[PDB]
Amino acid sequence: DQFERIKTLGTGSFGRVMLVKHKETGNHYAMKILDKQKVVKLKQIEHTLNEKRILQAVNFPFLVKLEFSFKDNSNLYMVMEYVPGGEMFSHLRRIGRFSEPHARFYAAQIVLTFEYLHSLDLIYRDLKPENLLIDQQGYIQVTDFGFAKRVKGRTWTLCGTPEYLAPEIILSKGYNKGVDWWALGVLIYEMAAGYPPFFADQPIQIYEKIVSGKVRFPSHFSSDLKDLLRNLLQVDLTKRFGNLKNGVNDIKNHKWFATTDWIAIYQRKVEAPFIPKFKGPGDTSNFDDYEEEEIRVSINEKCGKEFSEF
Amino acid sequence: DQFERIKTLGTGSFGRVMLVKHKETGNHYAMKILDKQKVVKLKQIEHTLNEKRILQAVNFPFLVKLEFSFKDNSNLYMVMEYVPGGEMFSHLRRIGRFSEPHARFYAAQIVLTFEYLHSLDLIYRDLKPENLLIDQQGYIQVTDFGFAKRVKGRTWTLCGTPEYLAPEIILSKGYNKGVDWWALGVLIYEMAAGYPPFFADQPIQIYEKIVSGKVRFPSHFSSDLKDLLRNLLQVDLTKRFGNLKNGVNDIKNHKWFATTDWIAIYQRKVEAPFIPKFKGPGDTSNFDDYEEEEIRVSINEKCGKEFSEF
Amino acid sequence: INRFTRRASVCAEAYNPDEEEDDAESRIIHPKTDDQRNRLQEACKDILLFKNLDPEQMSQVLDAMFEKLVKEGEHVIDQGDDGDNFYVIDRGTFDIYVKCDGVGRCVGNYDNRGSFGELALMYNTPRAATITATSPGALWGLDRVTFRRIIVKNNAKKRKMY
Amino acid sequence: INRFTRRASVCAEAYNPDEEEDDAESRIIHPKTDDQRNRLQEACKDILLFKNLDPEQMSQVLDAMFEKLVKEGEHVIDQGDDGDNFYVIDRGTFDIYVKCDGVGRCVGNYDNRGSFGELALMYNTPRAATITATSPGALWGLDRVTFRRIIVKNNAKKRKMY
């Protein structure tokens, strides 16, 4: 416990994350506690092992550093670099909807990270708007990578979220990329219409809408992406025109997507279209007013022989 | 020292209904308990004084003959009749779509109770799905009558239908008893379409939908109901069907009520379509359950002169 | 089958129509400039309540309007407590945070428009929002007591005069 | 603007039929009468899971079934513990009382009609609600472990051979 805590940063099914100050240098960093309670109550050691094996030899601009990792007799704390700025979903909900350049940059970053993951045979798995961090220099970062896999192979994993699924995952059918593409067709919708994509008071309606691929043309939508949205939803994948294995010779040759200078985007140089307003060390204006829950340290050994790989 | 409580039946933002049993004879009954702590802060003695006279103003079958109330140092109790059956809101939520006979019977009962309330010129004021209980005898009963009041002049105490509020009162203006139909008209939608009327959560959207004269008509409504809903669509409901001489001509002579007979129901002798199952005394299975909450209040006087009339 | 909703009782403040005695014309007096008054009128015209009001009531509210200067890092209004005030962001930007199961999620801000706590004047209800300072600014508005009093007085005058 | 519900994960046991366990072809068939199977097929031939399935898998699922006699008044399932079973509506009135924020409320009574409990087979989710038995009856206790194992094994064998 060589880290002085300050204030909690987030709590959810994924776990708990707090803010700490490096005693050996003095810098704000994030500390994620594995807890292991829900892991033992829900069996989630395979995902953690896969994420560890992946991070053991994986490093790219769209990834968070792994600096010092601490395991106790019954707990584990992973340290990471903090990126003051907040998630983009908060700003999207505060304003309403972004413009066409914003969606273009989002799609460019998505295809870039997809190509980066495919270069080393990897699958993103989970994808939600609550896993993005925008710094002051424009360097975007992604968090939450436990839902991944070393090699694609051919398994039958079931996870994610009900709001991002396809018929291939409901009845496992490999979905080596459909889960990462079909669901993506709805992501843009969340950043286009003035209301959430799925709005129903029962999961049966959501399942029926996911199975019955049909996008409802909003009352105010650009005619450029209309044709793309009218075909993004499909069953198979070979029939899709823009779906080459390279993934660069299809999105660049699109109608609206043409001037996407990826050479300057992948090199981290072009500034983001919306930089957050800073104020001081560890800003909180962009983040929510969440409070801190009851914290508890370790007492004795209970499940220390779990991650027996270090 | 007469009635002993058993368990709780349901608490709200005004009172708590619970089950009680007499110590002398022994019979299950309902008892509404209220705490003056919340009334002193809001100051609502005018609405409570009406119950003192409504207790005696009862000379009809529909009018529930309330029992004698009892005021304590910091709590009030009022015993009422027992309802082995349940509420209509629960049945509607369970089914969500009534047939033709059931809808006709409900409309006839609504018209009968409205005529009964108008005969005495007693403003109903309060109106919600919870104010409709189904007795074991196969009839309908109304609860919560404290909001009733008859004043020569106008009024301004806005309290009763916050969601189903006509656009004539949202602007802080007067109103008449005819509004009781409007606030209830939307309810018929729940017994026709299958989903709630307002498909939103923010009050702004509800107000915009109420002010915006537009109501859908799926392929599930009747023939006369469609015309009745289309006739009432303007913002300033000036051509109301209730604001007439007797108020029982255009509604009874309408095509919806092709066959009616109020004399048969006046004497109470027509079996309901389906009476709730009565599994002997204490059949509280139809009603919704609730956590137990005893009376934890200190025996101390708190403004007695303010609660003299009772 | 459905998420469902609560059926909580709603409340509003009462009044005694028999009490005709009131202020001479207005208690708070603060005549602003012409540009500020025009901007406030244009911002209020977008509200549904100001669609049927006459110029007389508009001028009365403008003359009786109350201005409050909020500095940086200031905090007065808080959630949970019974709401008893109302203001309008005349300029600047202030993000509002609303509770969401123990998480003060954001809703947005306003810029020379909007109305923080516009529904609180329609009925008495606890504070369902949380405001936070950002920079020096001025907010124009009126509390619920005086607003309701003026509204009821105008209603009674329009009802009895005719 | 909206309550904004949470978006928790829906992970579960990663069933990798390749080198797991030791047994093989553990079908464990439980035959019964023909009238019961014929009556259950009418409802089984309309679910989203059975609307697009091989006849062999449907026949195997219909053959594999365990019965459980439940009398009146028995809290076999309660909102709180983890959920691993799929109950079929065979006969008898069963009330679905959900603890909406710690308050019991009837969702939808089932009487030899409808279909429920399939959600438990979608992913790891706790008990949906309390299933109160108003009278004696015989329900179908289909555990989650059996359903994915053959349903994935048949597909794997077909993909390996065909």
Residue numbers in the entry:
A (entry chain B), B (entry chain A): 96 to 405
C (entry chain C), D (entry chain D): 104 to 265
What did the article's authors report about this structure?
The mutant is translated as a stable protein where the J-domain (residues 1 to 69) of DnaJB1 is fused to the cAMP-dependent protein kinase (PKA) catalytic (Cα or C) subunit (PKAc) (residues 15 to 336). In its resting physiological state, PKA exists as an inactive holoenzyme, which is composed of 2 C subunits and 1 R subunit dimer. All 4 R subunit isoforms share a similar domain organization which consists of an N-terminal Dimerization/Docking (D/D) domain followed by an intrinsically disordered linker that connects to 2 tandem cyclic nucleotide binding (CNB) domains. To provide mechanistic insight into the functional consequences of the DnaJB1-PKAc fusion protein that might allow us to better understand how it is a driver of FL-HCC, we used single-particle cryo-electron microscopy (cryo-EM) to determine a structure of the RIIβ holoenzyme formed with J-C. This is the first cryo-EM structure of any PKA holoenzyme and also confirms the differences between the compact RIIβ holoenzyme and the more extended RIIα holoenzyme that was shown by negative staining EM.
To obtain higher-resolution information, we used cryo-EM to determine a structure of the RIIβ2J-C2 holoenzyme. Due to a preferred orientation on the cryo-EM grid, data were collected using a tilt angle of 40°. After 2D classification and 3D reconstruction, we are able to get the structure to an average resolution of 6.2Å with C2 symmetry imposed. The structures revealed clear density in the core region of RIIβ2J-C2 holoenzyme, but density for the J-domain in the J-C subunits as well as for the CNB-B domains in the RIIβ subunits was missing. In addition, the density for the entire A-helix as well as the linker that wraps around the N-lobe that connects the A-helix to the β-strand 1 was missing. It is flexible with a break at Asp96J-C (equivalent to Asp41C in the WT C subunit). The density for the B/C/N-helix ends after the C-helix in the CNB-A domain (Tyr265RIIβ), while density for the N-helix in the CNB-B domain is missing. This is the precise break between the 2 CNB domains. Presumably, these unresolved or flexible domains are dynamic regions that form continuous states under cryo-EM conditions. The organization of the DnaJB1-PKAc RIIβ holoenzyme (RIIβ2J-C2) is similar to what was found earlier in the previously solved crystal structure of the WT RIIβ holoenzyme (RIIβ2C2); the compact overall quaternary organization was not altered by the addition of the J-domain, which is also resolved in our structure.
